[PDB]
Amino acid sequence: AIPTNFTISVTTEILPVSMTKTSVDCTMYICGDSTECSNLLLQYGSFCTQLNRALTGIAVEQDKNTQEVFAQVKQIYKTPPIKDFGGFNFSQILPDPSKPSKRSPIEDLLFNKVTLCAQKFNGLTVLPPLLTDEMIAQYTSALLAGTITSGWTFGAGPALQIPFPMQMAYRFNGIGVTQNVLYENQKLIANQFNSAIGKIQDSLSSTPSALGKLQDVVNQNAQALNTLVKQLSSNFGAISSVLNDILSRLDPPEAEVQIDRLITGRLQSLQTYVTQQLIRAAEIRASANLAATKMSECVLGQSKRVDFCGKGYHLMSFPQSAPHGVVFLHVTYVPAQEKNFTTAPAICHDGKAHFPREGVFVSNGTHWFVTQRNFYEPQIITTDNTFVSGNCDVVIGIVNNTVYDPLQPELD
Amino acid sequence: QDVNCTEVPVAWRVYSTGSNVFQTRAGCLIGAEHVNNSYECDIPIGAGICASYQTQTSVASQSIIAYTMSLGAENSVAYSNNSIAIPTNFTISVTTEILPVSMTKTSVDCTMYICGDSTECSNLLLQYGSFCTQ
Amino acid sequence: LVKQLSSNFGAISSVLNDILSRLDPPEAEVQIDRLITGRLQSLQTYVTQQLIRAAEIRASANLAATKMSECVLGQSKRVDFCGKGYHLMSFPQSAPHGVVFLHVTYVPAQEKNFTTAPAICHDGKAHFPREGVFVSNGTHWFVTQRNFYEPQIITTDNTFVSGNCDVVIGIVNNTVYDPLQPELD
Numbered sequence: 001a002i003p004t005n006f007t008i009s010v011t012t013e014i015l016p017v018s019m020t021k022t023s024v025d026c027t028m029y030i031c032g033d034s035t036e037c038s039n040l041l042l043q044y045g046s047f048c049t050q051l052n053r054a055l056t057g058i059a060v061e062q063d064k065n066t067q068e069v070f071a072q073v074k075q076i077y078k079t080p081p082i083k084d085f086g087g088f089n090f091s092q093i094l095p096d097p098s099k100p101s102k103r104s105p106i107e108d109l110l111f112n113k114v115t116l117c118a119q120k121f122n123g124l125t126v127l128p129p130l131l132t133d134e135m136i137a138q139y140t141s142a143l144l145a146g147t148i149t150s151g152w153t154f155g156a157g158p159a160l161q162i163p164f165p166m167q168m169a170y171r172f173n174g175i176g177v178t179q180n181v182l183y184e185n186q187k188l189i190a191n192q193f194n195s196a197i198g199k200i201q202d203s204l205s206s207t208p209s210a211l212g213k214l215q216d217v218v219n220q221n222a223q224a225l226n227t228l229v230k231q232l233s234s235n236f237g238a239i240s241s242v243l244n245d246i247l248s249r250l251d252p253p254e255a256e257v258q259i260d261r262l263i264t265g266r267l268q269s270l271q272t273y274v275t276q277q278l279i280r281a282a283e284i285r286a287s288a289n290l291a292a293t294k295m296s297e298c299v300l301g302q303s304k305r306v307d308f309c310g311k312g313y314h315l316m317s318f319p320q321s322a323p324h325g326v327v328f329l330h331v332t333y334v335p336a337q338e339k340n341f342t343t344a345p346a347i348c349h350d351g352k353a354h355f356p357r358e359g360v361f362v363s364n365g366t367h368w369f370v371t372q373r374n375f376y377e378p379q380i381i382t383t384d385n386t387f388v389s390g391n392c393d394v395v396i397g398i399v400n401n402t403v404y405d406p407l408q409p410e411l412d
Numbered sequence: 413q414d415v416n417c418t419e420v421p422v423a424w425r426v427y428s429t430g431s432n433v434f435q436t437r438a439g440c441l442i443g444a445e446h447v448n449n450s451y452e453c454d455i456p457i458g459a460g461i462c463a464s465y466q467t468q469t470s471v472a473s474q475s476i477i478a479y480t481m482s483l484g485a486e487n488s489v490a491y492s493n494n495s496i497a498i499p500t501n502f503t504i505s506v507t508t509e510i511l512p513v514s515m516t517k518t519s520v521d522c523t524m525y526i527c528g529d530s531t532e533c534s535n536l537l538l539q540y541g542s543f544c545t546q
Numbered sequence: 547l548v549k550q551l552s553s554n555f556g557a558i559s560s561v562l563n564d565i566l567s568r569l570d571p572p573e574a575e576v577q578i579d580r581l582i583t584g585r586l587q588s589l590q591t592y593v594t595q596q597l598i599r600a601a602e603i604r605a606s607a608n609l610a611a612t613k614m615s616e617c618v619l620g621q622s623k624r625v626d627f628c629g630k631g632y633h634l635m636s637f638p639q640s641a642p643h644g645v646v647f648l649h650v651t652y653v654p655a656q657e658k659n660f661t662t663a664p665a666i667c668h669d670g671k672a673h674f675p676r677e678g679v680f681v682s683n684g685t686h687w688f689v690t691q692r693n694f695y696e697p698q699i700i701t702t703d704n705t706f707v708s709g710n711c712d713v714v715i716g717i718v719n720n721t722v723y724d725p726l727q728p729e730l731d
């Protein structure tokens with residue numbers, strides 16, 4: 001079964017890369033302005049220093065994650081002023097200078113769907129990220145402009161200019177299809193690419209569950225913080241929950257029991273919160289590493305790993321940013337309408353047996369031809385497309401035919 | 413952090429107020445001057461602000477400065493619909509990568525760590541379950 | 547973990563001998579129980595931290611094993627995996643609780659631009675390169691490989707014919723040299 005047409009397809013993948021940084025003060029959360037609470041908690045050891053160290057480590061680890069997936073090339077490139085990429089239309093991915101935001105229409109659509117207080121209280125602080133969105137957008141724009149005008153060369157050394165049709169011809173001659181197919185159906189390929197890239201906005205704007213992966217971490221963090229805050233209204237087996245009333249209607253020789261019980265309860269609650277945060281950060285870092293690998297392999301070069309950079313034979317990929325995440329658009333090539341054929345392992349001329357150099361033998365029913373393994377184009381068997389090895393006695397299923405000779409003119 | 417530059421002297425004193433005061437997204441920075449240029453990043457602060465020593469520059473007057481990010485050197489390739497850039501030489505390069513594989517093995521005895529020679533501590537801890545075996 | 551032993555944990559003292567001396571057995575159990583609870587939870591925290599660190603260490607070890615299996619015992623075509631640039635070879639070295647990889651790679655160098663053409667149109671037929679692309683000095687035309695500059699004269703061995711000079715865009719005119727000319731003699 002040999003395909004006779006093809007179809008360019010575009011798929012989307014979403015990968016989280018970071019989670020919001022946060023920090024809590026050990027002393028302030030447990031004890032307020034009460035100094036007696038402070039010097040009662042001083043009885044315990046370094047339980048107010050390990051937690052801050054762990055949170056700081058988590059914060060710096062999250063800071064490092066973004067730099068690994070967006071700082072592959074330290075040389076920002078610019079697109080040419082005139083867009084004449086052989087009919088291709090990269091308007092929905094390239095940045096739009098008209099809008100005050102430096103994003104693209106797809107990036108703008110993404111940033112308007114992540115939308116779902118907590119200013120400051122009880123020693124709850126949120127640190128700002130080192131890299132703002134305005135610079136992640138610049139990194140993505142530079143990466144996008146690098147592949148359009150240079151191919152995969154800029155990912156290994158100096159950037160080499162290349163015409164886009166020639167680059168696509170290079171990429172087809174990486175999966176089996178020869179060069180002439182693109183140079184013939186340039187218009188069809190361009191139209192299919194434009195339609196596929198257009199349909200992405202419609203697909204994203206209609207599915208609320210498309211961006212579900214990025215919302216899960218935000219919701220989990222919000223629920224964890226809400227539980228941590230709500231845990232402050234529990235008596236923990238004492239007479240009350242507010243230290244002020246404990247300090248009033250009791251004696252200092254007796255009031256320490258409630259203070260100690262509340263301290264123990266709040267300390268173990270904070271322990272649970274910190275452990276949960278560390279466990280979540282582990283998976284977030286794993287996902288960030290996977291995203292970095294995907295960016296390095298799919299974008300800056302063609303990948304031959306099956307079902308890694310999209311579904312089907314991989315051709316190209318484009319990166320886009322999103323709030324605490326990245327989105328990959330994989331452009332792939334898949335076969336189409338097929339045809340029925342009969343075959344033969346080898347062709348037996350006089351004595352010698354012929355094997356194809358590249359491609360296989362297909363029989364229309366009367367004649368025979370040799371063709372490629374992924375696109376149907378028959379050619380007459382000659383001495384250039386086949387090589388002789390052995391005799392028509394050991395191979396199984398060989399057939400009979402005539403191998404054309406290309407030097408018949410010399411007879412004249 | 414998160415303190416607006418008026419309340420800062422409501423906390424060896426020059427760093428409390430005066431000299432040069434800069435207000436950023438992270439907070440209030442005291443002791444550095446905000447230049448109008450852009451350089452490679454250094455000791456980070458936040459919201460794309462890196463502070464560097466970099467004061468070899470009318471005496472040099474070495475001091476700490478603050479500046480915005482610079483995302484590498486600007487570049488632009490000349491692209492037309494007929495243009496090829498073919499290399500003519502090459503260069504063999506060697507790079508190094510470091511990878512941890514393991515750390516030091518260790519073991520801690522449950523009973524000895526908590527209770528010393530005191531058998532009373534031992535038989536009081538025996539009240540709990542299998543916490544010295546897990 | 548060691549310094550945590552010098553904390554009273556809300557008791558009267560931190561040394562068990564002192565607790566066992568200036569108290570009564572019916573009363574001394576409270577301090578012992580409190581110290582036991584505190585030390586037990588401290589050890590719990592230490593063990594949990596050790597497990598969390600060990601997970602990451604195992605992940606890094608697995609990555610190092612994959613790198614050794616792929617980059618060393620064979621060439622790798624994965625981009626930016628075994629070093630920066632086109633990967634050629636790699637060498638392993640040991641280090642205290644770790645490994646060091648030396649990646650030997652190939653990168654291009656000084657460059658000169660050229661002008662190209664998708665195909666060359668001889669009489670009727672249209673010729674496409676077999677490997678490499680067409681490079682024009684400005685007067686003549688040549689075919690060369692895609693990673694090193696060495697011009698060669700267009701022949702019938704470096705190109706293959708497919709179609710007509712009517713559907714491709716940007717085809718140009720030139721002469722395809724024939725290799726059986728001496729047969730005329």
Ligand SMILES: *[C@@H]1O[C@H](CO)[C@@H](O[C@@H]2O[C@H](CO)[C@@H](O[C@@H]3O[C@H](CO)[C@@H](O)[C@H](O)[C@@H]3O)[C@H](O)[C@H]2NC(C)=O)[C@H](O)[C@H]1NC(C)=O
Pocket residue numbers: 089091092
């Ligand atoms: C490259 O792609 C861009 C984006 O699709 C093209 O711009 C778009 O071109 C279409 C052409 O039909 C415009 O649609 C027209 O809009 C006007 C005004 O709303 C309407 O009266 C017409 O009936 C038609 O629907 C569209 O506005 C325009 N801009 C977008 C979609 O943002 C561009 O033309 C493409 N390049 C080339 C060379 O065609």
Ligand SMILES: *[C@@H]1O[C@H](CO)[C@@H](O[C@@H]2O[C@H](CO)[C@@H](O[C@@H]3O[C@H](CO)[C@@H](O)[C@H](O)[C@@H]3O)[C@H](O)[C@H]2NC(C)=O)[C@H](O)[C@H]1NC(C)=O
Pocket residue numbers: 398399400
């Ligand atoms: C493809 O064509 C070849 C040659 O045209 C066929 O080879 C022939 O195979 C038959 C039996 O397989 C043999 O023919 C015999 O030859 C002896 C020679 O003395 C003769 O006495 C017999 O009466 C008989 O004709 C022989 O191996 C060979 N013949 C010749 C002339 O080469 C082959 O069978 C064909 N295969 C198919 C699938 O059609």
Ligand SMILES: *[C@@H]1O[C@H](CO)[C@@H](O[C@@H]2O[C@H](CO)[C@@H](O[C@@H]3O[C@H](CO)[C@@H](O)[C@H](O)[C@@H]3O)[C@H](O)[C@H]2NC(C)=O)[C@H](O)[C@H]1NC(C)=O
Pocket residue numbers: 667718719
């Ligand atoms: C590369 O070579 C081809 C073949 O020589 C050139 O194609 C020529 O195109 C012109 C007009 O586009 C045509 O010539 C015309 O032929 C008719 C035949 O009756 C004649 O009456 C006209 O007066 C005119 O000469 C024809 O398609 C073809 N020339 C020939 C002799 O077949 C092509 O232009 C060349 N490339 C470049 C860039 O010049």
Ligand SMILES: *[C@@H]1O[C@H](CO)[C@@H](O[C@@H]2O[C@H](CO)[C@@H](O)[C@H](O)[C@H]2NC(C)=O)[C@H](O)[C@H]1NC(C)=O
Pocket residue numbers: 396397
């Ligand atoms: C494919 O299967 C068919 C069906 O069995 C094979 O046809 C038979 O092949 C044997 C082997 O020589 C002959 O003896 C029979 O006479 C054939 N039957 C018919 C109806 O033709 C066929 O050979 C198989 N193909 C190959 C390459 O082995």
Ligand SMILES: *[C@@H]1O[C@H](CO)[C@@H](O[C@@H]2O[C@H](CO)[C@@H](O)[C@H](O)[C@H]2NC(C)=O)[C@H](O)[C@H]1NC(C)=O
Pocket residue numbers: 493494715716717
């Ligand atoms: C490469 O780009 C140039 C710039 O537009 C193209 O040159 C024009 O091509 C059209 C189409 O035939 C002509 O009508 C113009 O007269 C050309 N202008 C000049 C100044 O020559 C050129 O055709 C493009 N080449 C390819 C292969 O697309």
Ligand SMILES: *[C@@H]1O[C@H](CO)[C@@H](O)[C@H](O)[C@H]1NC(C)=O
Pocket residue numbers: 340341342
């Ligand atoms: C495919 O093989 C031949 C066509 O050469 C045809 O007779 C046969 O019925 C086809 N089989 C199917 C399942 O279509």
Ligand SMILES: *[C@@H]1O[C@H](CO)[C@@H](O)[C@H](O)[C@H]1NC(C)=O
Pocket residue numbers: 416417418
């Ligand atoms: C900080 O204080 C000044 C003067 O009191 C005020 O104008 C400014 O708006 C304050 N900062 C913010 C972020 O409001």
Ligand SMILES: *[C@@H]1O[C@H](CO)[C@@H](O)[C@H](O)[C@H]1NC(C)=O
Pocket residue numbers: 490659660
């Ligand atoms: C490309 O090379 C030509 C000479 O062949 C030269 O005239 C032109 O300036 C070069 N292009 C660039 C961008 O340097």
